[PDB]
Nucleic acid binder design. Structure first.
Ligand SMILES: [Mg+2]
Ligand SMILES: [Mg+2]
Ligand SMILES: [Mg+2]
Ligand SMILES: [Mg+2]
Ligand SMILES: [Mg+2]
Lengths: 63, 137, 143, 145, 67, 199, 70, 100
RNA sequence: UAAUUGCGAUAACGAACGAGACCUUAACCUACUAAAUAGUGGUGCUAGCAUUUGCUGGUUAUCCACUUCUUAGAGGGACUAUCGGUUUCAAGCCGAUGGAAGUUUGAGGCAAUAACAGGUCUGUGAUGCCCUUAGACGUUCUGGGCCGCACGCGCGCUACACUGACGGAGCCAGCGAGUCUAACCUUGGCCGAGAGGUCUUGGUAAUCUUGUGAAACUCCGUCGUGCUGGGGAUAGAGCAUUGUAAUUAUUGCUCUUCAACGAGGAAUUCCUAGUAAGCGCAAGUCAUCAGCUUGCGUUGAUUACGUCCCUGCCCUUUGUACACACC
């Protein structure tokens, strides 16, 4: 399984029908000059680092 | 000289006097507090500041009022507060601050009592918030 | 070395005093042993037919040593537990009064416990003597 | 714990007072399978028989089994109190029995049959199959099958 | 929520309106002076009023506020 | 080392508590490090404790749960099934026995074994009902690892000879070694499996 | 009655040459690896702890933690 | 000089304290020796009842409280100025019992 | 903002109710007052152990001093205080520190205007009308019934076990109640296996019951994974208690019998911290009868710190052929 880690530099807001998912602007630990927006289920805050099984999949909002 | 400690409803009154390192809890030694797993909870305010560290004090506590765990927490707070008060009154303010700093950096309510008290039960259910099961059909 | 019953807490002292009452030879048993449950809230007799009366005696003697006078009703409340009332909720039930009274009378006969002027049974002089001897023996036996 | 080789002296399921008893269960609870002896009666009987309760029923003895049997059939003769018996002042001789056979049900059916013949309410309820101890029958014990 | 109601806001408003050459921007002396310069019927209400008066003093020291 | 004495005799096994490199009543904390960088700041070794019964307020704030000792979090999760609600002394005894059994089998610093099991069994990708594959927060990863480990131990100890302490020890050991014989690893693998099918 | 109640001597070597191949010994281990039933696994481990190869780690009621001797 | 104990019981704390303070001041102004006014814990005579006079509606319960406060002051005083200090206390709502 | 809470905006200005404020209670106060109805030390007397005077003990008319624990009066204390950040421009909000306590500090009590053909005429010597009023629908007495069982539903208790049952031993609460015209709460002694009986005793109660020696829980053992020592339904026999009266078993106790139940479909409830859950205790009813309720304490999690998807609520805009108002 390919290795990639990232770190929330900004928490955008809640999304999902029930508000359970949160959108995070995440910056990859390697090659820190690039940011992708991801959907994370559990509680997150700033400078908190996530593991992404898939690296490049831009998360959109969840209607 | 006289201090106390409380967790929920148990109060533990500790007398710290001039003596030679004798630590009684209900007339028994502190080695016999006996929940058999929370004995280090009452050992902790001795192992924190200094393991023996004291041939000069005598601590006698008497605890009543709660349950086994509550009483253990009350006595563990009482003897810490007794050491702090004895050092404040007699030994020196520098050493009092020095041991207060360790107790508070390890604080498990060693010096400040836990302020959590039971919430009153309200009608329409058992417990403070739990309600009786509601049926519609 | 200034050893009291309050120096060995709960199990070593009681097992050791029970063993001492066993080896003392005096049984003091009423013969009800092996038949009785020790509480109406119990479901079975004590698992060790021989020795449970001695353990009860040692427990009662230590209990009276640790405090002032104690009566049969206090002993029944102390030694009674919760009762399984079937599909009904549990409830505390007092233990058997006859066994507690007879064990109090046995300690009275052996001079471990005496009458209190205000009621109940109080540890006696030789009571404290033997209890403290057993405590010091247990302490030096097992640190 | 010790040498328990006992190649030919261990017994599997046995026979005891018209009831097959498993010898692999400790003696008291193995004995409880006979209709009429429960946990407490079996404990008292096995302690009046001077039998070691800490061993299984299959290795007890070929004599202690009959000692237990005779103590059970005659409880009051081996210093076992009347209040420990399930049949005291039975209905017709005043003696205290402890029915221990495939006759617990025989005594039960004699009681039920005399209650039916006297036309008592309990007998009538038993005949109808309903509850007899005054329980509410509106909601409980519906299927009973 | 810790929004002060009108009975606190206007009481502090009038207190600051007629007692500026008076109690400083410290709550401890503000409440003591409120004890003498106002008939507040509860200690909790007096504390609320004094705290809002102190807040108003502190934000007055950086420039006048409306009203 | 310098086991000086006072009137109440307290054993030297308790007088050797902190004169030297700190530990548990039995087990070192300083030689415990998280297996990865994602779960640091959410596993809470060092601070060390003498017993997993720090009856502290960790629920009045959102992330104060992250600063509770991970051993005590595991104890709290063992406090479950409803019939065992409360019974914290029981759960602490179970944790002590579990750590002892882990130290017996491939000693490997049972605290380190526990933290490795948690790090291995935290689900890295889950699904939300919109059915959509979302990522998992580190705190949620830790909580789901603890829940999966404790639930697997519970359902293994249910209706079988071996004790809850032994089932917890086996679960934690298998999870730390990262094997598909553990309930928590199997469940994490299943969640990550049907998350990629809902990407 | 299911297994290993009283007899346990047709391979009575399995209470002695059992110490290798595992470091953890308990009531449940004795039941699980087809040697003893838990009815007497407790007294078996107590016996061979009194004279035998296992040394106790915790020795708590309703539990047992023993390990092979070094 | 006879030793007497005065027990004051009332639901109204303000007038119970008025009586207790009148007694203390009278004992001081008559130069008596008195053990201070002991305040035994107030008994909250609570009663729980159903608000509805029938059986309909949400089961809302209602707790009523009667707080009874009790005080005893014992001292030593001669007959005339013990009768006068028991007859000075006729404050309404406070029950006063002097026991010798 | 919890708030028609406020900043403010402004054909409104100034007010009233509601919210808040308030009151009760739960947190703290080595500060004040004061306590053989609370407690602590030391002197008396003084059993044990140890004997260089020390540990633990009893001394309820055995002294003195004190109020840390307890009690209850008067008060103090918190006002989101201080410091940062961020707010349009403030109201505020978010962090950290200090603090006993920073979510209205926690929990309640009280709680507007309009209504409902909501419930109650079976609480009322509240009550209109109608009915009945001597063979009564008044009232009383005996007996029965309200509980009756092919079955459907709601609240629950006990469980399905080893995170356990059983046996010993450990031995820890809080809220309360209790009898003088008299039979209430009962300690202690004795008898009884038990339930219980009997002789006394204390208590009109911070005094005695009562430290309510509660239960879960803890330790050490037996059990050993099996409808098993899980479970205790059903039933038989006997012993007691309450009561004038226990049959349709009041309840308690002893022995015996040992059912379903192997964690429960679709559905559905309650709940965010000393909370859920587990655990028992007091009170209410009460001669007797808790699986109920009202409170109380003991042990004490997991999860979340959000959203409007479901079910609803508030405000605004909008459509309406609805006004008995989308049933
Ligand atoms: Mg017990
Ligand atoms: Mg109607
Ligand atoms: Mg009815
Ligand atoms: Mg009812
Ligand atoms: Mg329609």
């Amino acid at each position: 399984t390919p290795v990639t880690l990232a770190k929330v530099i900004k928490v955008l807001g809640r999304t999902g029908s029930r508000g359970g998912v949160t959108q995070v602007r995440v910056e990859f630990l390697e090659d820190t000059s690039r940011t992708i927006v991801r959907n994370v289920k559990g509680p997150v805050r700033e400078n908190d680092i996530l593991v992404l099984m898939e690296s490049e999949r831009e998360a959109r909002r969840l209607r | 000289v006289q201090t106390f400690g409380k967790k929920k409803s148990a109060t533990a009154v500790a007398h710290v006097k001039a003596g030679k390192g004798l630590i009684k809890v209900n007339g028994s030694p502190i080695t016999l507090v006996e929940p058999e797993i929370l004995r280090f909870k009452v050992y902790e305010p001795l192992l924190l500041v200094g393991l023996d560290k004291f041939s000069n004090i005598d601590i006698r506590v008497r605890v009543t009022g709660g349950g086994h765990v509550s009483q253990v927490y009350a006595i563990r707070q009482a003897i810490a507060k007794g050491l702090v008060a004895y050092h404040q009154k007699y030994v020196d303010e520098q050493s009092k601050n020095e041991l207060k700093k360790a107790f508070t950096s390890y604080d498990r309510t060693l010096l400040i009592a836990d302020s959590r008290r039971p919430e009153p039960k309200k009608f329409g259910g058992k417990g403070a918030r739990s309600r009786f099961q509601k049926s519609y059909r | 070395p200034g050893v009291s019953v309050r120096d060995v807490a709960a199990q070593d002292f009681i097992n050791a005093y029970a063993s001492f009452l066993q080896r003392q030879g005096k049984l003091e048993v009423p013969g009800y042993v092996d038949i009785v449950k020790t509480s109406s809230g119990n479901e079975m007799p004590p698992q060790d037919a021989e020795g449970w009366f001695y353990k009860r005696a040692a427990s009662v003697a230590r209990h009276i040593y640790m405090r002032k006078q104690v009566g049969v009703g206090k002993l029944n409340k102390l030694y009674g537990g919760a009762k399984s009332r079937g599909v009904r909720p549990y409830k505390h039930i007092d233990a058997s009064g006859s066994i507690n009274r007879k064990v109090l009378q046995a300690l009275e006969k052996i001079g471990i416990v005496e009458i209190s002027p205000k009621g109940g049974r109080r540890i006696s002089e030789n009571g404290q003597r033997d209890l403290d001897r057993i405590a010091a023996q247990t302490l030096e036996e097992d640190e | 714990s010790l040498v328990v080789q006992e190649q030919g002296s261990f017994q599997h399921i046995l026979r005891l007072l018209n009831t097959n008893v498993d010898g692999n269960i400790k003696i008291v609870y193995a004995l409880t399978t006979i209709k009429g002896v429960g946990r407490r009666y079996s404990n008292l009987v096995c302690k009046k028989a001077d039998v070691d309760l800490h061993k299984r029923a299959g290795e007890l003895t070929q004599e202690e089994l009959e000692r237990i049997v005779q103590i059970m059939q005659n409880p009051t003769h081996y210093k076992i109190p009347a209040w420990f018996l399930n049949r005291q002042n039975d209905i017709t001789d005043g003696k205290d029995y402890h029915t221990l056979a495939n006759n617990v049900e025989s005594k039960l059916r004699d009681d039920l049959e005399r209650l039916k013949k006297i036309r008592a309410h309990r007998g009538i309820r038993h005949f109808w199959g309903l509850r007899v101890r005054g329980q509410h029958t509106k909601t409980t014990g519906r299927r009973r099958a | 929520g810790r929004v002060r109601t009108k009975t606190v806001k206007r009481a502090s408003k009038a207190l600051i309106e007629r007692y500026y050459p008076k109690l400083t921007l410290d709550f401890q002396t503000n409440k003591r002076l409120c004890d003498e310069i106002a008939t507040i019927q509860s200690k909790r209400l007096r504390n609320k009023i004094a705290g809002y008066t102190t807040h108003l003093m502190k934000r007055i020291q950086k420039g006048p506020v409306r009203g | 080392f310098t086991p000086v004495v006072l009137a109440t005799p307290i054993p030297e096994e308790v007088q050797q508590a902190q004169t030297e490199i700190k530990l548990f009543n039995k087990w070192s904390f300083e030689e415990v490090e998280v297996k990865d960088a994602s779960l640091v700041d959410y596993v809470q070794v060092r601070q060390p404790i003498f017993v997993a019964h720090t009856a502290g307020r960790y629920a009045n704030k959102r992330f104060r749960k992250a600063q509770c000792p991970i051993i005590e979090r595991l104890t709290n999760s063992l406090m479950m099934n409803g019939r065992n609600n409360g019974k914290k002394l029981k759960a602490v005894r179970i944790i002590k026995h579990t750590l002892d059994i882990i130290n017996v089998l491939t000693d490997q610093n049972p605290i380190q074994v526990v933290v490795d099991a948690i790090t291995n069994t935290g689900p890295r990708e889950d699904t939300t009902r919109v059915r959509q594959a979302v990522d998992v927060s580190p705190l949620r990863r830790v909580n789901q690892a603890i829940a999966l480990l404790t639930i697997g131990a519970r359902e293994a100890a249910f209706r079988n000879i071996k004790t809850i302490a032994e089932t917890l020890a086996e679960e934690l050991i298998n999870a730390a070694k990262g094997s598909s014989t553990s309930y928590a690893i199997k469940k994490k693998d299943e969640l990550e499996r049907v998350a990629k099918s809902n990407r | 009655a299911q297994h290993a109640v009283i007899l346990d001597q047709e391979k009575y070597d399995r209470i002695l040459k059992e110490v290798p191949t595992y470091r953890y010994v308990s009531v449940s281990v004795l039941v699980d690896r087809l040697k003893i039933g838990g009815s007497l696994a407790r007294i078996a481990l107590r016996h061979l702890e009194k004279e035998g190869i296992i040394k106790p780690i915790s020795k708590h009621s309703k539990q047992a933690i023993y390990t092979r001797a070094t | 000089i006879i030793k007497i104990r005065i027990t004051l019981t009332s639901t109204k704390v303000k007038q119970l304290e008025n009586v207790s303070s009148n007694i203390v001041k009278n004992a001081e102004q008559h130069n008596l020796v008195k053990k201070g006014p002991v305040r035994l814990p107030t008994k909250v005579l609570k009663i729980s009842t159903r608000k509805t006079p029938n059986g309909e509606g949400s089961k809302t319960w209602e707790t009523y409280e009667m707080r009874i406060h009790k005080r005893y002051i014992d001292l030593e005083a001669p007959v005339q100025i013990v009768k006068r200090i028991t007859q000075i206390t006729i404050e309404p709502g406070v029950d006063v019992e002097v026991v010798v």
